[PDB]
PDB file of C-alpha atoms and ligand atoms in Angstrom:
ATOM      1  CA  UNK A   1       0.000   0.000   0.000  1.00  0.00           C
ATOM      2  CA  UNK A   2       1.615   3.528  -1.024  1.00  0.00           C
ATOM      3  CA  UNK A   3      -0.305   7.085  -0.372  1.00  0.00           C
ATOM      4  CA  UNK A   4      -1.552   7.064  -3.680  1.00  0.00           C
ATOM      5  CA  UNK A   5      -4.112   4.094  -3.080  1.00  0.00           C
ATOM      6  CA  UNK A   6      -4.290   5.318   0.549  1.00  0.00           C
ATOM      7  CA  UNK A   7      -5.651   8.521  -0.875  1.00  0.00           C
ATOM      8  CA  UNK A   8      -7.290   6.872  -3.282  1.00  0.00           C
ATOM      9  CA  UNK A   9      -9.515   4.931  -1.398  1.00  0.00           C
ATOM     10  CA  UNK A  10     -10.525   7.762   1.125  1.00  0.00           C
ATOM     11  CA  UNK A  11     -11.384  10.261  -1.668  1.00  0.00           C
ATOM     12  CA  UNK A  12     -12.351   7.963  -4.211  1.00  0.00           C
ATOM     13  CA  UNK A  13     -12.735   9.214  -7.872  1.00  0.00           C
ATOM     14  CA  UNK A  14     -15.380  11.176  -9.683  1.00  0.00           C
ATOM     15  CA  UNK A  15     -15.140  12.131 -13.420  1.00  0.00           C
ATOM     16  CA  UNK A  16     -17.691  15.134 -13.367  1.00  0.00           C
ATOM     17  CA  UNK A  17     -18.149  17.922 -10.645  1.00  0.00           C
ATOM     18  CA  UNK A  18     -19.765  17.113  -7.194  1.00  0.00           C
ATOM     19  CA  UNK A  19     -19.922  18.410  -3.860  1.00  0.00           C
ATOM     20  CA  UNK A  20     -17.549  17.576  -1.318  1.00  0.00           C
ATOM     21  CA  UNK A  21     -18.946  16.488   2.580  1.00  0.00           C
ATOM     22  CA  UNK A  22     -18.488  20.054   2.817  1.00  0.00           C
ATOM     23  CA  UNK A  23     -19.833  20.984   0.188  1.00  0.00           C
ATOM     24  CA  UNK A  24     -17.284  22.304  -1.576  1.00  0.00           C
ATOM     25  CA  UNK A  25     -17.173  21.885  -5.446  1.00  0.00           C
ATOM     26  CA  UNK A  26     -14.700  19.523  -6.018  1.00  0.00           C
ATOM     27  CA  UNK A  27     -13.801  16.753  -8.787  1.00  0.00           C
ATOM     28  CA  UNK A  28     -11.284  13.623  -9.528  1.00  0.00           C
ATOM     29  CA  UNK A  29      -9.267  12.521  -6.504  1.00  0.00           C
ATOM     30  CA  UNK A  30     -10.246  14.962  -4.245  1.00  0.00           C
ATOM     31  CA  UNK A  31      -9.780  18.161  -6.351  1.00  0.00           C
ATOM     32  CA  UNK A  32     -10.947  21.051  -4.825  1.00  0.00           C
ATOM     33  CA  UNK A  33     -11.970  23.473  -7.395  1.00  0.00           C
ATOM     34  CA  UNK A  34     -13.504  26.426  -4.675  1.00  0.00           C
ATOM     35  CA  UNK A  35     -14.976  26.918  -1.604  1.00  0.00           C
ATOM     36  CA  UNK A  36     -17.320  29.649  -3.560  1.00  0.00           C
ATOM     37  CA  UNK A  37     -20.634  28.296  -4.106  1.00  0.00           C
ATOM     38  CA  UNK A  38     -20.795  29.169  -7.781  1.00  0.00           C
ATOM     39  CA  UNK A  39     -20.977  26.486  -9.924  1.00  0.00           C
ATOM     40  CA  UNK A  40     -20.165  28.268 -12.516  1.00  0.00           C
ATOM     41  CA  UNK A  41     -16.921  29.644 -10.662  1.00  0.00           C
ATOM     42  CA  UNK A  42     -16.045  25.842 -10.411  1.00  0.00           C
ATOM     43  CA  UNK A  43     -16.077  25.534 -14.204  1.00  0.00           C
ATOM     44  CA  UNK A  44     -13.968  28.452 -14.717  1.00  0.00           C
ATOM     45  CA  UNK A  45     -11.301  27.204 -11.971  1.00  0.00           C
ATOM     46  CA  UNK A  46     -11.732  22.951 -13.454  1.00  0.00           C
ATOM     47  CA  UNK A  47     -10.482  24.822 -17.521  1.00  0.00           C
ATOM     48  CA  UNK A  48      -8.205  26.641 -15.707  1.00  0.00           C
ATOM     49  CA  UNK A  49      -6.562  23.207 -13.658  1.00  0.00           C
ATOM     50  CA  UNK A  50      -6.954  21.545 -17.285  1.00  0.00           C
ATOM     51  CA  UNK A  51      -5.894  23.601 -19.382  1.00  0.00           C
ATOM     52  CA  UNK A  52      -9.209  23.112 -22.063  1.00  0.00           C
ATOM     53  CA  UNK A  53     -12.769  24.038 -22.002  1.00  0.00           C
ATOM     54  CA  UNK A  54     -13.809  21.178 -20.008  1.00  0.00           C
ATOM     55  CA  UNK A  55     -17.548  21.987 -19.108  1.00  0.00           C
ATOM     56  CA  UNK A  56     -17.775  20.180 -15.943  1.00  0.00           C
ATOM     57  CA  UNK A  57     -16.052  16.653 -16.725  1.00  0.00           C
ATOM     58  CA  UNK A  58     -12.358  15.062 -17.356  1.00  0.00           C
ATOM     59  CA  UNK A  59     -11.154  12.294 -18.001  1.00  0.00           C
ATOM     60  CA  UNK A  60      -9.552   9.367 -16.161  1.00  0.00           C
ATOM     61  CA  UNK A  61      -6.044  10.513 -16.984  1.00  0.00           C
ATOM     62  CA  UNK A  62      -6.997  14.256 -16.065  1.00  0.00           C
ATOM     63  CA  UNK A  63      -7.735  13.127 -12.809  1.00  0.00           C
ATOM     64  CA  UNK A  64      -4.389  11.433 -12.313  1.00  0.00           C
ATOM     65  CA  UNK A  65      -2.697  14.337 -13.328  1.00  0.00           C
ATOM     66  CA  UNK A  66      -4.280  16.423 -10.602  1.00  0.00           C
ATOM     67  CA  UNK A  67      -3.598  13.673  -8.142  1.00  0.00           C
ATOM     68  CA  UNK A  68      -0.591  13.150  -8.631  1.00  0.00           C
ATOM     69  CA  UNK A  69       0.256  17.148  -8.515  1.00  0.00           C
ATOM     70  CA  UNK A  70      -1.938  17.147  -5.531  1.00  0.00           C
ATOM     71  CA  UNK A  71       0.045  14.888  -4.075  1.00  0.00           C
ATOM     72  CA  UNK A  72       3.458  16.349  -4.548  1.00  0.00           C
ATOM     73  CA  UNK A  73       1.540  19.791  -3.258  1.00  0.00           C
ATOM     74  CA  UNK A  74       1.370  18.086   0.016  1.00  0.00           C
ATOM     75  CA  UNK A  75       4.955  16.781   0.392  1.00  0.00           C
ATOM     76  CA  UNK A  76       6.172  20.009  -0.664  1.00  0.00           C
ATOM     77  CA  UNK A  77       3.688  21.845   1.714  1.00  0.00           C
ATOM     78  CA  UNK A  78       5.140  19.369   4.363  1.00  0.00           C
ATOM     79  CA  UNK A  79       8.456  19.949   4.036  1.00  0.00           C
ATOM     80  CA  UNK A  80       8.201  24.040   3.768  1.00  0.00           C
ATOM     81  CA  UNK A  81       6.204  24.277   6.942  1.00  0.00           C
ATOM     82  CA  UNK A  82       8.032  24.679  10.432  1.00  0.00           C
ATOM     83  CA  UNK A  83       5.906  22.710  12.495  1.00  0.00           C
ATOM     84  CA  UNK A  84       5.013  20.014  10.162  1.00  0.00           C
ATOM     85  CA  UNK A  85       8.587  19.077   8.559  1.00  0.00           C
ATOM     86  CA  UNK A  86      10.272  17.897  12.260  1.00  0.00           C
ATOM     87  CA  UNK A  87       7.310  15.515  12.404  1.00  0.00           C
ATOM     88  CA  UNK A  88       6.794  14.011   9.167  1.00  0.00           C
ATOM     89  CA  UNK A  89      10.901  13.701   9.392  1.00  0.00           C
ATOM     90  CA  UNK A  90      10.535  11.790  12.606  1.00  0.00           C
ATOM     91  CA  UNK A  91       8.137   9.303  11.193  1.00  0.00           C
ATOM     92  CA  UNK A  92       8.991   5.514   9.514  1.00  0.00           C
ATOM     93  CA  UNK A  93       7.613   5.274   6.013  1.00  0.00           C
ATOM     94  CA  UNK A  94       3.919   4.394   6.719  1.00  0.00           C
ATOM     95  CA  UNK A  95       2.849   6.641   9.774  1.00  0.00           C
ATOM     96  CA  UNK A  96       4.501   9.324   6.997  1.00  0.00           C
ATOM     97  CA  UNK A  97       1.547   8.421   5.102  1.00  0.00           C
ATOM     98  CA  UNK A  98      -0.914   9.115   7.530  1.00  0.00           C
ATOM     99  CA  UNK A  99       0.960  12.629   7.937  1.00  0.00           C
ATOM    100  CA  UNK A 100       0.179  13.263   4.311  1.00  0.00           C
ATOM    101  CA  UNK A 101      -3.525  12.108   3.962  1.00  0.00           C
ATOM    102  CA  UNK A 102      -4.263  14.810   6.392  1.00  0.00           C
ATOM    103  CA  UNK A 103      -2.686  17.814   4.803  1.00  0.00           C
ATOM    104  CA  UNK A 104      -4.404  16.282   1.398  1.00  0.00           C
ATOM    105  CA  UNK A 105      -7.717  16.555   3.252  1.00  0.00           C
ATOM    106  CA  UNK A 106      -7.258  19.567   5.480  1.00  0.00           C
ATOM    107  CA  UNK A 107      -4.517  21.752   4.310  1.00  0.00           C
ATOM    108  CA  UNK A 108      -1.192  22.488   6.327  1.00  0.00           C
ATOM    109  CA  UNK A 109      -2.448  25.323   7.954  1.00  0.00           C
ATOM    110  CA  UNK A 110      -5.324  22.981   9.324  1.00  0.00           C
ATOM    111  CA  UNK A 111      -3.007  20.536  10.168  1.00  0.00           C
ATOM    112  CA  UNK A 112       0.014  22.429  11.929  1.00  0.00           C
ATOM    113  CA  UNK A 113      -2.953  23.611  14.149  1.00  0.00           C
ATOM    114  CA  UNK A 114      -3.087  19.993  15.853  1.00  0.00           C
ATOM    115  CA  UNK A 115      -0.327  21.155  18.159  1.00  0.00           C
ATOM    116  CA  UNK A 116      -0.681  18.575  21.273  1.00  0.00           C
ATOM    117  CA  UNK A 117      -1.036  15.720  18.692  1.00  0.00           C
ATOM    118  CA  UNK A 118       1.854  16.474  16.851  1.00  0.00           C
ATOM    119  CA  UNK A 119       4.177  16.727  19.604  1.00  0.00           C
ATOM    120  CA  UNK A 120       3.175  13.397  21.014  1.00  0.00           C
ATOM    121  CA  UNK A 121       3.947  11.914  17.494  1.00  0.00           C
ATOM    122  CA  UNK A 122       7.076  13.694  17.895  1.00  0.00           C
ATOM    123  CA  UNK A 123       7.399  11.604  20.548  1.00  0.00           C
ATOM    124  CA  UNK A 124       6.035   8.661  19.435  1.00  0.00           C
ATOM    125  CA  UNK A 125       3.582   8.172  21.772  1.00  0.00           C
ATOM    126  CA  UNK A 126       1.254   6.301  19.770  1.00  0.00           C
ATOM    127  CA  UNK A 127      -1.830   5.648  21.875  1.00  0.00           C
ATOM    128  CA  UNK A 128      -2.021   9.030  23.425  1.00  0.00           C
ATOM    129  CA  UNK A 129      -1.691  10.661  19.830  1.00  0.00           C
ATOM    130  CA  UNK A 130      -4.286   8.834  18.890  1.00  0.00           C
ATOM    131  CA  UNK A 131      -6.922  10.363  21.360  1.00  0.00           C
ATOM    132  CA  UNK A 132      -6.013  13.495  20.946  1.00  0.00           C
ATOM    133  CA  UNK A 133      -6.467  13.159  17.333  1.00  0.00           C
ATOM    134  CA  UNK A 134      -9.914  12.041  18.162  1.00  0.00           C
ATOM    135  CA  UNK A 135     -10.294  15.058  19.668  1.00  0.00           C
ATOM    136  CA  UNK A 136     -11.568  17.075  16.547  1.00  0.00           C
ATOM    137  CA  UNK A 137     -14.267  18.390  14.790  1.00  0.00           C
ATOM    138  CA  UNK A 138     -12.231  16.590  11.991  1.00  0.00           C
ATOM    139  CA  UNK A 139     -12.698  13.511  13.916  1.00  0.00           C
ATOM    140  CA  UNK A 140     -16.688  14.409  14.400  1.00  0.00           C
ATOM    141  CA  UNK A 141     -17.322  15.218  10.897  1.00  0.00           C
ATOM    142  CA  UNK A 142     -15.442  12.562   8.876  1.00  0.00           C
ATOM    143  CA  UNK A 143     -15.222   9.780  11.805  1.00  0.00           C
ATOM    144  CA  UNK A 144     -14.944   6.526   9.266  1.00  0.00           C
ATOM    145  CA  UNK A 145     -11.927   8.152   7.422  1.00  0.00           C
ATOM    146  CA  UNK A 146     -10.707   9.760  10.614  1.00  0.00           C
ATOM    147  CA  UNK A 147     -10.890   6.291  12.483  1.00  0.00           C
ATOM    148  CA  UNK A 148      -8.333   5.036   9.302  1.00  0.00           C
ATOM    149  CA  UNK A 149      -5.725   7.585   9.734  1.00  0.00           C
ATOM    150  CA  UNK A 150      -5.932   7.466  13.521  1.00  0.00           C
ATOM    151  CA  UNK A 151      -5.290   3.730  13.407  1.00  0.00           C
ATOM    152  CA  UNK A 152      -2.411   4.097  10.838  1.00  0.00           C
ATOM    153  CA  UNK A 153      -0.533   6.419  13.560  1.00  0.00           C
ATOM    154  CA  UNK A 154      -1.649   4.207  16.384  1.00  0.00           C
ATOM    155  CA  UNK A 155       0.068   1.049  14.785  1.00  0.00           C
ATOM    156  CA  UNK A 156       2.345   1.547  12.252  1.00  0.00           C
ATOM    157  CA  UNK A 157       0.686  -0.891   9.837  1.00  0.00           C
ATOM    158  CA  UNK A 158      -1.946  -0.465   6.977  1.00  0.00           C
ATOM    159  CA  UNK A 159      -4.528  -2.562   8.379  1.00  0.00           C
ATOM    160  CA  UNK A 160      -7.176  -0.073   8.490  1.00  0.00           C
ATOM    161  CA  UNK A 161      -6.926   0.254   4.918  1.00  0.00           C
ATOM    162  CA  UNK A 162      -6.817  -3.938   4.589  1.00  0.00           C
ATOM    163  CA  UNK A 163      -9.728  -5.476   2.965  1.00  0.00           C
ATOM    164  CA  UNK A 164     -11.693  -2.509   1.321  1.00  0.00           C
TER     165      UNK A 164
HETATM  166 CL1  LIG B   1     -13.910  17.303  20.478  1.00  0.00          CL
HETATM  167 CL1  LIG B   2     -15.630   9.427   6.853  1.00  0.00          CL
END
């Protein structure tokens, strides 16, 4: 399992516009287009990220592009921000992971604002991350994908993610 079918699974893919659990316009991967409740601003913003008069749908590979530059976003996001870099440089390879899926899904300014529970993943203490993780609207609003990442820190492993 590698962040790309991690993500993959938690944001699933749509080929034409829809609203996010927010209900954000949003598209692909997890795309984002705008928080402005305009479809037609969504439109405008999807031809921009495509480069072509799209009129509300892409294609398979589209969306792949966008992930994929989503993804690097993240990482590079990650590793620019203060607070987030000592973590994410602390972690093994698959708690990284977890790191990640959250900025995808919340944005580093979101994240960096989980003080407590990033210190005591600094400090690798697993089980007391973990509840103050679950301490979150995030947690509240999104509980089935929260409960994923959560376990991912927790143990180390990708079991959360085996079998779907
Ligand atoms: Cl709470
Ligand atoms: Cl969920």
């Amino acid at each position: 399992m590698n962040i790309f079918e991690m993500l993959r699974i938690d944001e699933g893919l749509r080929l034409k516009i829809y609203k996010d659990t927010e209900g954000y316009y949003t598209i692909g991967i997890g795309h984002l287009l705008t928080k402005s409740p305009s479809l037609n601003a969504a439109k405008s913003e999807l031809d921009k990220a495509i480069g072509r008069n799209c009129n509300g749908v892409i294609t398979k590979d589209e969306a792949e592009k966008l992930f994929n530059q989503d993804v690097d976003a993240a990482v590079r996001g990650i590793l620019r921000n203060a607070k987030l870099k000592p973590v994410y440089d602390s972690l093994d390879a698959v708690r990284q992971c977890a790191l990640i899926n959250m900025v995808f899904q919340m944005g580093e300014t979101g994240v960096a604002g989980f003080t407590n529970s990033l210190r005591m993943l600094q400090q690798k203490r697993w089980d007391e991350a973990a509840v103050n993780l679950a301490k979150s609207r995030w947690y509240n609003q999104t509980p089935n994908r929260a409960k994923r990442v959560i376990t991912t820190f927790r143990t180390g492993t990708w079991d959360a993610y085996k079998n779907l």
